[PDB]
Motif scaffolding. Structure first.
Motif, PDB file in Angstrom:
ATOM      1  N   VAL A  93       0.851  -1.180   0.000  1.00  0.00           N
ATOM      2  CA  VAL A  93       0.000   0.000   0.000  1.00  0.00           C
ATOM      3  C   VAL A  93       0.890   1.233   0.000  1.00  0.00           C
ATOM      4  O   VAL A  93       2.072   1.178   0.342  1.00  0.00           O
ATOM      5  N   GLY A  94       0.305   2.355  -0.397  1.00  0.00           N
ATOM      6  CA  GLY A  94       1.020   3.610  -0.358  1.00  0.00           C
ATOM      7  C   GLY A  94       1.150   4.145   1.054  1.00  0.00           C
ATOM      8  O   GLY A  94       0.500   3.693   1.996  1.00  0.00           O
ATOM      9  N   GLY A  95       2.022   5.136   1.199  1.00  0.00           N
ATOM     10  CA  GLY A  95       2.229   5.767   2.483  1.00  0.00           C
ATOM     11  C   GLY A  95       1.244   6.854   2.833  1.00  0.00           C
ATOM     12  O   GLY A  95       1.375   7.482   3.887  1.00  0.00           O
ATOM     13  N   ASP A  96       0.255   7.095   1.980  1.00  0.00           N
ATOM     14  CA  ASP A  96      -0.715   8.158   2.199  1.00  0.00           C
ATOM     15  C   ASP A  96      -1.722   7.731   3.264  1.00  0.00           C
ATOM     16  O   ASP A  96      -1.584   6.686   3.906  1.00  0.00           O
ATOM     17  N   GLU A 100      -2.762   3.895   5.153  1.00  0.00           N
ATOM     18  CA  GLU A 100      -2.928   3.726   6.591  1.00  0.00           C
ATOM     19  C   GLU A 100      -4.342   3.276   6.926  1.00  0.00           C
ATOM     20  O   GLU A 100      -4.539   2.416   7.791  1.00  0.00           O
ATOM     21  N   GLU A 101      -5.340   3.849   6.251  1.00  0.00           N
ATOM     22  CA  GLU A 101      -6.726   3.476   6.512  1.00  0.00           C
ATOM     23  C   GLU A 101      -7.000   2.027   6.129  1.00  0.00           C
ATOM     24  O   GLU A 101      -7.648   1.294   6.884  1.00  0.00           O
ATOM     25  N   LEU A 102      -6.520   1.597   4.961  1.00  0.00           N
ATOM     26  CA  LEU A 102      -6.730   0.214   4.546  1.00  0.00           C
ATOM     27  C   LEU A 102      -6.046  -0.755   5.498  1.00  0.00           C
ATOM     28  O   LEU A 102      -6.619  -1.788   5.862  1.00  0.00           O
ATOM     29  N   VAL A 103      -4.818  -0.442   5.910  1.00  0.00           N
ATOM     30  CA  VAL A 103      -4.137  -1.278   6.892  1.00  0.00           C
ATOM     31  C   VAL A 103      -4.865  -1.227   8.227  1.00  0.00           C
ATOM     32  O   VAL A 103      -4.995  -2.244   8.919  1.00  0.00           O
ATOM     33  N   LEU A 104      -5.360  -0.048   8.609  1.00  0.00           N
ATOM     34  CA  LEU A 104      -6.163   0.053   9.822  1.00  0.00           C
ATOM     35  C   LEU A 104      -7.446  -0.755   9.698  1.00  0.00           C
ATOM     36  O   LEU A 104      -7.912  -1.350  10.677  1.00  0.00           O
ATOM     37  N   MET A 105      -8.032  -0.790   8.500  1.00  0.00           N
ATOM     38  CA  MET A 105      -9.240  -1.578   8.285  1.00  0.00           C
ATOM     39  C   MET A 105      -8.986  -3.053   8.557  1.00  0.00           C
ATOM     40  O   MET A 105      -9.787  -3.723   9.218  1.00  0.00           O
ATOM     41  N   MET A 106      -7.869  -3.579   8.056  1.00  0.00           N
ATOM     42  CA  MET A 106      -7.565  -4.988   8.267  1.00  0.00           C
ATOM     43  C   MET A 106      -7.088  -5.256   9.685  1.00  0.00           C
ATOM     44  O   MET A 106      -7.345  -6.336  10.227  1.00  0.00           O
ATOM     45  N   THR A 113      -1.398  -8.023   9.400  1.00  0.00           N
ATOM     46  CA  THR A 113      -0.868  -7.178   8.341  1.00  0.00           C
ATOM     47  C   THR A 113       0.651  -7.086   8.381  1.00  0.00           C
ATOM     48  O   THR A 113       1.223  -6.142   7.827  1.00  0.00           O
ATOM     49  N   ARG A 114       1.317  -8.046   9.027  1.00  0.00           N
ATOM     50  CA  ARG A 114       2.774  -8.068   9.026  1.00  0.00           C
ATOM     51  C   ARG A 114       3.342  -8.257   7.629  1.00  0.00           C
ATOM     52  O   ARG A 114       4.481  -7.854   7.375  1.00  0.00           O
ATOM     53  N   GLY A 115       2.578  -8.854   6.723  1.00  0.00           N
ATOM     54  CA  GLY A 115       2.977  -9.028   5.345  1.00  0.00           C
ATOM     55  C   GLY A 115       2.642  -7.869   4.435  1.00  0.00           C
ATOM     56  O   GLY A 115       2.828  -7.979   3.220  1.00  0.00           O
ATOM     57  N   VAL A 116       2.151  -6.763   4.981  1.00  0.00           N
ATOM     58  CA  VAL A 116       1.785  -5.599   4.185  1.00  0.00           C
ATOM     59  C   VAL A 116       2.974  -4.651   4.138  1.00  0.00           C
ATOM     60  O   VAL A 116       3.479  -4.222   5.181  1.00  0.00           O
ATOM     61  N   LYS A 117       3.417  -4.321   2.932  1.00  0.00           N
ATOM     62  CA  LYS A 117       4.518  -3.395   2.726  1.00  0.00           C
ATOM     63  C   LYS A 117       3.983  -2.010   2.394  1.00  0.00           C
ATOM     64  O   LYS A 117       2.895  -1.861   1.833  1.00  0.00           O
ATOM     65  N   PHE A 118       4.760  -0.993   2.750  1.00  0.00           N
ATOM     66  CA  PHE A 118       4.396   0.396   2.515  1.00  0.00           C
ATOM     67  C   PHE A 118       5.341   1.007   1.494  1.00  0.00           C
ATOM     68  O   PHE A 118       6.564   0.935   1.652  1.00  0.00           O
ATOM     69  N   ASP A 119       4.774   1.602   0.452  1.00  0.00           N
ATOM     70  CA  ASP A 119       5.530   2.318  -0.569  1.00  0.00           C
ATOM     71  C   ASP A 119       5.307   3.806  -0.325  1.00  0.00           C
ATOM     72  O   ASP A 119       4.243   4.343  -0.644  1.00  0.00           O
TER      73      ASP A 119
END
Lengths: 163, 60
Positions: A93-96, A100-106, A113-119
């Motif tokens: 996901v992006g750093g915007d 953050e909201e999508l990661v917060l959603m999950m 979400t340990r496998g979620v990377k931030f660009d």
């Protein structure tokens, strides 16, 4: 310890020795979105173009392909956890704020979400395209893929994949 | 046209739809029933041109 290496030599190892916690973990891989039904086909008897209150009539009389529409893998991960299982989501996901909201959603759905990377240098769910008029018909070409479609093979979380 | 098909219809639609019908259709229908005016035959004849009826918005 190299995600991009061939999965035939030494594993990522690490210090996992105790048994994994039940239920078994599930990895859902791909883009993360809210809603965004991917299966789209041409359907007859459209409702009013503007009056969206009539569009419920196509929910209880749906197109045959849209009877049980699927979604992004995040929905499968979120739904799996609410069913009692454990799910981990792998994606970028992006750093915007939206990332953050999508990661917060999950995260609120107990999805790992340990496998979620931030660009940082990207905008979540944002694809930059160029409009070109080819053969008299307007078309588009993906100039830059969104961070969801930009997960490198070196960014995979082998801890998630092993479990 | 599909007013109550999907959502709950407006509670005043029956009052609303009736009045519009009266303005659209209930006026010329009664005006067309207005007959000619004459006693037997004299220098008099009165009639209403139904097709030329008009309504003016209230001042107040």
């Amino acid at each position: 310890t190299n995600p991009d290496s061939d999965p035939a030599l030494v594993d990522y190892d690490d210090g996992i020795d105790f048994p994994y916690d039940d239920p078994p973990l599930v990895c859902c891989f791909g883009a993360v979105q809210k809603e965004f039904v991917p299966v789209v086909r041409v359907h007859d008897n459209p409702m009013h173009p503007d009056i969206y209150s009539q569009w419920k009539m196509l929910q209880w009389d749906p197109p045959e392909f849209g009877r049980a529409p699927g979604g992004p893998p995040s929905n499968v991960a979120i739904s799996h956890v609410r069913l009692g299982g454990r799910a981990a989501f792998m994606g970028k996901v992006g750093g915007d704020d939206y990332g953050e909201e999508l990661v917060l959603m999950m995260n609120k759905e107990r999805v790992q979400t340990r496998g979620v990377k931030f660009d940082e240098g990207a905008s979540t769910a944002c694809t930059r395209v160029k409009i070109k008029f080819e053969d008299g018909k307007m078309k588009a070409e993906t100039v830059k893929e969104p961070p969801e479609d930009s997960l490198l093979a070196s960014e995979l979380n082998l801890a998630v994949l092993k479990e | 046209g599909k007013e109550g098909t999907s959502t709950i219809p407006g509670f005043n639609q029956i009052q609303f739809e009736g009045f519009y019908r009266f303005i659209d259709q209930g006026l010329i229908e009664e005006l067309s029933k207005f007959p000619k005016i004459e006693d037997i035959d004299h220098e008099i004849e009165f009639q209403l041109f139904v097709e030329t009826y008009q309504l003016v918005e209230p001042l107040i």
